[model samples]
Target: GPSPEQRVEIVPRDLRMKDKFLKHLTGPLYFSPKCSKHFHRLYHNTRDCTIPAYYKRCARLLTRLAVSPVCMEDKQ
Candidate 1:
């Protein structure tokens, strides 16, 4: 998927779904005015680099004791 396409699909309660990642992000170097290539969530200075980014796969384990199998992990 490219040239106007992307990929992030998998199978099982262990899928690589796009998730949000917010933090002071080191400094203001990594910024995203439109949160592009990012979920509807992120973390950063409210006036600095309030950019956007996706979480990681530091997950996906047995039972994984998972929830929200709909692909949307809204930890809001």
Candidate 2:
């Protein structure tokens, strides 16, 4: 596996900020390939900070699932 590179500061996602983080993940900011790549990198950095093994795994999967579709859409 590749080493996790810290790209950006991940906003802490507590109960109050959950929606904000989710929105940012699926937001228009990720529409471009460049932005999507950055978003993907952010997820990796966040996953490294994640406490539990399960959640880290889930975050990794979510990054793939979320970004692939947007990339597909960009292709069409």
Candidate 3:
């Protein structure tokens, strides 16, 4: 058993899908209709309001990454 004061890190429920989800949303893969729908569902439906500020901040960042036109227009 761990000490009461020891903090445990909280991760997303679908750990395997975490990278896949972000990748699908942030990359050209997002253009696909399937990926787009999935992204919308995850962004609008799966987010929990009770998560910590850090998680919310990171979610905001990932949202920006998904929609940032500057990243889309880059030739790289």
Candidate 4:
């Protein structure tokens, strides 16, 4: 047994697509810290929204080597 604050309760949940749900709702897409540049592009989705280029290009970035985000805070 452990004290109240000694351990954390475990929570089981699906995290597969949480990267999407956790973003935007988490902060502004552009100025967000958790936003992934690789998930983004060197351009735009016609002012931050799209499908054509995204599903094609951004999807490739989904490669296991380049498939996620972190708090780096850089827009360059």
Candidate 5:
């Protein structure tokens, strides 16, 4: 028996295509801490509701990766 705080639970999930996910999403796709803060500043000031293309690219990459298959190394 363990304390409530000490208990750990891991939810079971379906297998995902990790290699494909990494291929597209692992690069410089997401925003950094600095960029997030800057975006917040701009959003506050401009109120334009428009985001950078990099944001969309990030999302696209993630979605593609989620469905794509994992890559395997070629045997020589």
Candidate 6:
């Protein structure tokens, strides 16, 4: 396997404070074509800090799943 190229920035679920964190991040941010794969791998690896956007995305997915009765029924 090739040596790992990028690292992930993982955030905790509850620490999802967007307004506070957006300031810390420098933007016009971007990624290479492999960014999605790298980002997810790093996220799973780190999963400690709080990445608001990622948490929000995951929450939205979870909400969709919760709404879908055909999926596993988990009371939210």
Clashes of each: 3, 0, 0, 0, 0, 4
Pairs with backbone N, CA or C atoms under 3 Å apart (clashes), candidate 6: 8-42, 11-49, 11-50, 12-49
Model 2, residue 49: distance off in Å is: 16
TM-score of decoy 2 = 0.28
Deviation of model 6 at 19, angstroms: 9.4
Give lDDT tens digits, candidate 5, residues 1-76: 1112123332122212322343355453234443444434433333121222233344454433333332112222
Itemize residue pairs with steric clashes in candidate 2.
none
Model with the higher lDDT, candidate 1 or 6: 6
lDDT score of residue 48 within candidate 5: 24
Candidate 4 shows a clash count of 0
Q: How would the candidate models be sorted by lDDT, starting from the highest?
A: 2, 3, 6, 5, 4, 1
Where does model 4 exceed 4 Å of error?
1-32, 35-38, 42-54, 62-76
Error of 2 at 68 (Å): 0.7
Q: Please write out the lDDT profile of model 3 over residues 1-76, one tens digit for every residue.
A: 1111124435455443444444554444343443465455555455321233233444555565455543244433
Please identify which of the two predictions, 2 or 5, would achieve the higher TM-score against the true structure. Answer: 2
Candidate 3 lDDT score relative to the true structure:
0.43
The alpha-carbon lDDT assigned to residue 18 of candidate 5 equals 26
Measured against the true structure, the TM-scores of the candidates, in listed sequence, are 0.15, 0.28, 0.29, 0.20, 0.23, 0.28
Q: lDDT of model 1 at residue 75? A: 33
Task: Please rank every candidate by TM-score, starting with the best.
Answer: 3, 6, 2, 5, 4, 1
What RMSD does each model have against the real structure? Answer: 16.0, 11.3, 11.0, 15.0, 15.9, 14.3
1-76 per-residue lDDT for model 1 (tens digits): 1111123322233222222222221212232333322322322212111211122221221012122232224332
lDDT against the true structure, per candidate, is: 0.23, 0.44, 0.43, 0.32, 0.33, 0.37
